[PDB]
Amino acid sequence: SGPVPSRARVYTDVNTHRPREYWDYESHVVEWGNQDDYQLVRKLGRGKYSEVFEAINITNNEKVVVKILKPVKKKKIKREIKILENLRGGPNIITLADIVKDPVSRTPALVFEHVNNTDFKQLYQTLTDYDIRFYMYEILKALDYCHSMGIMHRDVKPHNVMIDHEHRKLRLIDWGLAEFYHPGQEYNVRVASRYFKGPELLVDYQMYDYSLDMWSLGCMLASMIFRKEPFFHGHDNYDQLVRIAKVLGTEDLYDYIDKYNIELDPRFNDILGRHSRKRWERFVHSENQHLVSPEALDFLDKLLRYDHQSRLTAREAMEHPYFYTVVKDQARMG
Ligand SMILES: NCCCn1cnc2c(Br)c(Br)c(Br)c(Br)c21
Numbered sequence: 001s002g003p004v005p006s007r008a009r010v011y012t013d014v015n016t017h018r019p020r021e022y023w024d025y026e027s028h029v030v031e032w033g034n035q036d037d038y039q040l041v042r043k044l045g046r047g048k049y050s051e052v053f054e055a056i057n058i059t060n061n062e063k064v065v066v067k068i069l070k071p072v073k074k075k076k077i078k079r080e081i082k083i084l085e086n087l088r089g090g091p092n093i094i095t096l097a098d099i100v101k102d103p104v105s106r107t108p109a110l111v112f113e114h115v116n117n118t119d120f121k122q123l124y125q126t127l128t129d130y131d132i133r134f135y136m137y138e139i140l141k142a143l144d145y146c147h148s149m150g151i152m153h154r155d156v157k158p159h160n161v162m163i164d165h166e167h168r169k170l171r172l173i174d175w176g177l178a179e180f181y182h183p184g185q186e187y188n189v190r191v192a193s194r195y196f197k198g199p200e201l202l203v204d205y206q207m208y209d210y211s212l213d214m215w216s217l218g219c220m221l222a223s224m225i226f227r228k229e230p231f232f233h234g235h236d237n238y239d240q241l242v243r244i245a246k247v248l249g250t251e252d253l254y255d256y257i258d259k260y261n262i263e264l265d266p267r268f269n270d271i272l273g274r275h276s277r278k279r280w281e282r283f284v285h286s287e288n289q290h291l292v293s294p295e296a297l298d299f300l301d302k303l304l305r306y307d308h309q310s311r312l313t314a315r316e317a318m319e320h321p322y323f324y325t326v327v328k329d330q331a332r333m334g
């Protein structure tokens, strides 16, 4: 027999209940705007998939952000546009304002509402324990919405989380790897960055779901509260799972491989070897603490599970005692 199928615990049939036009991005007709309504002001940086620019909308004098995408297949740009349009207005999710093509180069470019040029990886060292609790909850707000909209991000990492620390506003960006979730659909395992890949990707289990983002988020919290970036520092894809096994242990990893009947490489089992589960208190040291708390380690333990179905959902995570005072302070201050 082959690999045992899996289903998302929550938001399983959200795309099934919605009409076909919601998730069938291949059938969607992209309505392009005019690039002449936007002028590039300055350069904000460069990514491995695009080049981000600061721009101005000359029709309403509004500041925007233009993302000139590098050449890519036409089905990926339509998927990202449809996902961004379906997530417009969502909390802590970037707001796609327009989509344009160069009149000569014909290369597509995404236009978003203005967000400051400061990501989470640039501030996680200068933030207190409550500030990482607050921003982690804001990330969960954006993850629960897109999951409830039947959309996996599949590239959660500190660089894709923009922070406007003056205004306490957070935005989850880079939706180029996002994909609609459909029960029983096998997805591509070449998603996310190596340090943030879930074990389902490292063992080539293709029927994953929203819970992949929860693992990536678990690696982000572990990197911050322990001040070790990245937390799982694998040098290749095999070593990434080894680095994970040296922390969670090989016992729960093999019981995860046999649970879904995953066929690993015969030499991969000899590479993983046998490792005991290391308690989270062994990475506390003395400087990176004060960011560590019993509810933090318990919250981290419930995110970094081998079994994707055993991880916490974004909603269940938002109700963990790690955010108890955060949700109490948010409900009275805004
Ligand atoms: N899915 C596309 C999200 C938009 N986006 C992508 N890369 C971005 C960078 Br780098 C910066 Br800086 C800013 Br501001 C934004 Br907005 C970015």
Ligand SMILES: [Cl-]
Binding pocket: 010, 143, 144, 147, 210, 211, 313, 314, 315
């Ligand atoms: Cl979820």
